[PDB]
Amino acid sequence: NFDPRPVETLNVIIPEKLDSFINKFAEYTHEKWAFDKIQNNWSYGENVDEELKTHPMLRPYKTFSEKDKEIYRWPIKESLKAMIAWEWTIEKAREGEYNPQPPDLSGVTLSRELQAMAEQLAENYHNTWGRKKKQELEAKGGGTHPLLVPYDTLTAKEKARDREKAQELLKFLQMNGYAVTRGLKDMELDTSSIEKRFAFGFLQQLLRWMDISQEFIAHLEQEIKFFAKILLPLINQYFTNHCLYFLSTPAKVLGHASNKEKEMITSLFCKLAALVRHRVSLFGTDAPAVVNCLHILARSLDARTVMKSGPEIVKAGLRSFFESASEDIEKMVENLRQNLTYTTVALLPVLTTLFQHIAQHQILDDVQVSCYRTLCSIYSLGTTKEKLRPALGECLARLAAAMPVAFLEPQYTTKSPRERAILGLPNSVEEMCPDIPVLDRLMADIGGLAESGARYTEMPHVIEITLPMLCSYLPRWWERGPEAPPPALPAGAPPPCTAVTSDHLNSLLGNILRIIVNNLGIDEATWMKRLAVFAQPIVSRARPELLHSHFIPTIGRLRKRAGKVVAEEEQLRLEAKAEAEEGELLVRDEFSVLCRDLYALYPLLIRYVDNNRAHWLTEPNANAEELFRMVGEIFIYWSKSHNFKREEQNFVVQNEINNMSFLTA
């Protein structure tokens, strides 16, 4: 593969100046060798050996033969000739024809460019020496090749010999003004912050192949499938494993990632959105792969700061994509009650995108008007009719939690001048949203609806959109309330826009308790489970004064129901029969339904059990006795039925859940 160019070495004629220079070099080498011999006291002898340390060499070289002079005539001249023949970088130095101390050179830092040039020179010397060695082995016939050692992992002998040669060259090139350096690079950008890691080049090249693939999207009227199958799992596992180094800016690492990483991530999101659109049925074979890649990107959507240094660029594309999504949502909500498959069975990853990422403290007018438009579109003729509701609830909770100001009542602070000076929606809340009332009216309506205590039925268009929204809304602004103690002076200094107090939390707890106790277990009821899952910290600011009314009726009803079902089961079964077996399996199904409802309802009551246990440790009351009686009754009822345990184990197996929500943490 590698074919070097053999430059002539013996065909040239040595000039008189070169002959004088090589004669002077040979004389200097002989003088230095004589000085070393007289310093180390190498005496004469009648024979050459090692045990007597005898070597007669202090004689003039003019009386020697050509064979002995040839081994020392060109000790370093071959390398210089190769350098002057191969590399055409001949410098122009000259035209043709009392005890000072050495300075300190290791104190100052070493330049990256100089080190790179020295490493390149060493690599060139090693490669060329290996080339002479291979040529000599071929000339001699061949045989073993013990020199096949990588340069990065060279042996100690070579790693000492090359350093000795380099330091000898440095100490011999000090005079006569000799310095060779061929390079032009900067270490402040190529190996400092951005181009030092290989991630930037990887992102640029994957962008290049993505654009190349996009260049012929309208070609169906081979290569793309193989390219996708190669890249998508690889980039997915790269995001899955290597994700901590791109968490934030390198100044706050541990997480080294500049705005280039965020720009590449946004470009990848735009490219995958484009591939999703246009043709959908053509790329239906890789649809699960696309969904998995979107999920991975959403779970790794760091979304670093871009507008601080880059003038948006991708912000317009994101706005256009969000507008297209809102228009598509309006189209479905209009025509329901090419992108049909994506808008039906693939909008859940979109509504789930960055849902859990932007949830802490860690937010714009455009996002606010977009979520307002989507809410108005959904609420317009959204009844009757898709298995698209948990994703909508998650998107609503994410949009509510990530709000610069209050999005429920006008009591904006950071509004834009275009809302009043340009043609747009008014800055008010009640006028802009015709179906979202003020916070007080909304909570009054919710309390009135909860006070009714109606049955479950189905009604999958009011409770599952209202209860999760308020349940994710109130705790978010509970710490920013005008009455709650703020952790900073600036938070209390600005006029607050929200108004949440303990009465709202008490009403929330009462409504949740009423909706749990109203849901009788006769069939599958996933609405309560979804509500419990979507709002875990609903007891973070509980008010422990109405604990008797919360728990004593509920535990009494639970014990009564358990007693009556176990008594009915015993009465119907007694012996073993086909009718007895049918009754037993019906009771097992009822037990499974009750156990599923209990699995939904545990986290809140368990957190409250921890809380009031702590309160009783601080100050007890008259509740531990009846609590213990209820616990004993329910556990002896559970223990007195092996079929109940078998059904519970079967339901746990068929649930395929890790039950990691109990530990919280």
Partner: protein, 48 residues
Amino acid sequence: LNGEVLMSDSGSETAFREIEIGDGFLPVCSLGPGQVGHLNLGQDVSSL
């Protein structure tokens, strides 16, 4: 730490995997430089 068992990564009452007795056990406390600690071994109800 404060009225609550310290939770581990696994999520259960993690121990040191059934330490063999050998000779016995003894309470040992440590202290770094520039640190102030209070060792309350417990001699009365008011101590706890």
